[PDB]
Structures are given as C-alpha cells and as structure tokens.
Design a protein around this ligand. Structure first.
Ligand SMILES: O=C(O)C(=O)Nc1ccc2nc(NC(=O)c3cc(Br)c(Br)[nH]3)sc2c1
Length: 360
C-alpha cells in the first residue's frame, strides 16, 4: 500500500522517463493548492523552480489541518501527506526529500520527509501572522531517470491553462535558475482562454460565445470563437485534465455545433439562397474552442486520460450546446451572419471542388 508507489511509479504519476511524470509531480501539488482556491481561501499560488532541481508550491490558504489524528496518532497533515485516497502522498513517496511547511493559526508548522517517510513528526518551528501551505519537493532520481531537470515551458503552459480553467485564481511561476518569471491571473476564465488562443489570430466576430451550465450532475462550460483562418482548434477538458485525442464531450460539442448551425442556416434561409448543404467540416474551419466539462466519476480510454469515454457527457454537452448556441445565434445576429457567411463560402468551395472532381 505505502511502498507500492515506489515500485510502480508510472502507474500512479505517469511516464517517469519522458518528463510527463516529473512535471505531474508539480501539477498534483498545484491541484491541491487549486482545490483550496476552489474552497475560496487560496487567492494566490506561487510555483517556484529552485536552483537545486526542486519545485515548491507556496499558497496563501487556511493551511493543511495540524489537528492531531486520533486513530493514526500522528497529525492530520502527515495522514494527507502519506495515506493514499492522485494525492500528494504519491508526490511525497517519489521524492528523495520533501519539505512541508504549514502556516495555520499563528504557528509555522514544519516537517521534512525522505522517500515518503518523515524524518521527524510535525512540530512548530516558529510563529507567524500569515496563513498558507508550502510544499517543496526534490524528485527522486531512483524513480525519474532520463528527464530529471524541471522545464519552465511545460510548467508555464499548464499553470497558465489551469488559471483559465479556474476562473479567478493567481498563479505565479518563478525560475531562480535564470530569473524567468510569469504571472497568470486570467479573470475571464475559459472565455479569456479563447481570447489568448485568438490574440495572434484575427477573429471575424467580436462576441465570444460562452456558457456555464449544470444538467443531470454534469457541469458543462464551453467557450468558442471563429477566426479568419481555416484551422480547427478545440481544446477539451474533464475536471481540468486535458484530452489530446478528444472524446465524448468533443463528440457532443461537434454534434450540437452542426445541428444548431444547420438549423439556423435552413430556418433563416441561408442554405436555400446559397444552393449548398453545409457539413460539420465547414463549421469546424477557423474554429477555436474550449470545452471544460465537470464530471463527478468520469471514465477515460486509458490512465493517460487523453480520451473521455463517459457516454453521458456527450448527451449532456450536446443538448446544452443546442439550446445555448441557438440562443447565442439569435441574440448575436451580426456574429451569426459573419460566421454563417464564412461557413457558406467553405460549403460552396468544398461542393464546387467535389463537383470539379466529378465534372471531368
Ligand atoms: O474549512 C476549513 O476550515 C479548512 O480550511 N479545511 C481544510 C482542510 C484540509 C486542507 N488541506 C489543504 N491543503 C492545501 O491547501 C494544500 C496542499 C498542498 Br500539497 C498545497 Br501547496 N496546499 S487546505 C485545507 C483546508
């Protein structure tokens, strides 16, 4: 139970050679800081890549409970830091050292670990006016072999997308090796995610379509905006975990996208005037989108979580999109007319190209 993680580290944290698992150590500690930010205590998180190949995550939350656990005997923090529910105990187990520092009441509680085992019990080092949780870990080279050094751009890209995915939360990334610094505090949320993806692009319409709904236990937050280009870029998420290969949520998004735009174009009479039938591929051209769904007990294809297979999430995303995208199209006719105008041109060009193949 306790030593099972050190034996098979790739099972609990992911690939230990290519750098996925090593950087996932930081993200698991960050996710716990973010979970406290979702509680409404932690307003700032400070990820720090230190000079000696170690990452720390200082937050300004209430702190990990120092309250003494009666069954175990040790503190409640030690239970969270060792006993499995991924969990921070996985990060603690696969680390040559882990410095835990908790600022709770007005007492700086400190604890050092080595390979998951604590060097001593949790003890009050000094006093403090502030409150928060700091965890600094040194990843074990026995576990992590090839990619051993932390990588700024990997932590940068994920902490930035975590800031979008967690509406109003501050993430600071500091690199003491070269003084490189970032501050991600995107208050716009997944709407601002779409802006960031479109900041170098040229949006053809101003109003970004957005919603955030909760039907049959499944949270569905979607934000999208077309651009002048012809590239589809839909970024899919399930409990803030990305999906590279897409999934059911992506399927329901695309399902509703096509139905809604076809239903609009046929009703308003755009397909009739154009003499052309539009497909999903045309509606997909130039699309940037984010689909952040919140599922309580989701199913994935594999432990990598690159594809979501929860069939309930498709129907959840599809019907919610279908109502609100249709509501968007009527309420924003200038955006609708610009978007539909691009889709008709894409449908005209495709059908003319297909007609060109057949006709000689
Ligand atoms: O309503 C309360 O009175 C309350 O505040 N309860 C509570 C319970 C448990 C608990 N655990 C936390 N851990 C963290 O925030 C964290 C872990 C890492 Br690793 C890092 Br970095 N930050 S906050 C927290 C709060």
């Amino acid at each position: 139970g306790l030593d099972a993680v050190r034996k098979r580290p790739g099972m609990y944290i992911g690939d230990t050679d290519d750098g996925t698992g090593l950087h996932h150590m930081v993200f698991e500690v960050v996710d716990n800081a973010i979970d406290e930010a979702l509680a409404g205590h932690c307003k700032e998180i400070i990820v720090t890549i230190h000079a000696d190949n170690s990452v720390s995550v200082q937050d300004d939350g209430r702190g990990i409970p120092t309250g003494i656990h009666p069954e175990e005997g040790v503190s409640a923090a030690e239970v969270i830091m060792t006993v499995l529910h991924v969990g921070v105990s996985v990060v603690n187990a696969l680390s040559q050292k882990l410095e835990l520092v908790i600022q709770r009441e007005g007492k700086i509680h400190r604890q050092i670990y080595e390979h998951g085992v604590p060097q001593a019990p949790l003890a009050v080092t000094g006093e403090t006016e502030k409150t928060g949780t700091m965890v600094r870990f040194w990843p074990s080279l026995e576990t992590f072999t090839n990619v051993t050094e932390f990588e700024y751009e990997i932590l940068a890209k994920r902490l930035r997308e975590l800031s979008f995915l967690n509406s109003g939360v501050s993430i600071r990334l500091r690199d003491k090796r070269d003084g490189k610094e970032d501050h991600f505090h995107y208050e716009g949320g997944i709407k601002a995610f779409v802006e960031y993806l479109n900041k170098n692009k040229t949006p053809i319409h101003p109003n970004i379509f957005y919603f955030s709904t909760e039907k049959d236990g499944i949270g569905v937050e979607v934000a999208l905006q077309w651009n002048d280009g012809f590239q589809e870029n839909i970024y899919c998420f399930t409990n803030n975990i990305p999906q590279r290969d897409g999934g059911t949520h992506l399927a329901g998004f695309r399902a509703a996208m096509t139905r809604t735009l076809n239903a609009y174009m046929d009703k308003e009479g755009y397909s009739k005037k154009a003499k052309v039938s539009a497909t999903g591929d045309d509606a997909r051209e130039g699309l940037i989108a984010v689909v952040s769904v919140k599922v309580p007990d989701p199913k994935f294809s594999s432990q990598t979580k690159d594809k979501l297979v929860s069939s309930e999430v498709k129907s959840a995303v599809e019907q919610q999109m279908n109502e609100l995208l249709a509501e968007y199209l009527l309420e924003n006719p200038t955006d609708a007319k610009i978007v539909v105008g691009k889709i008709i041109d894409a449908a005209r060009a495709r059908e003319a190209a297909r007609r060109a193949r057949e006709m000689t």
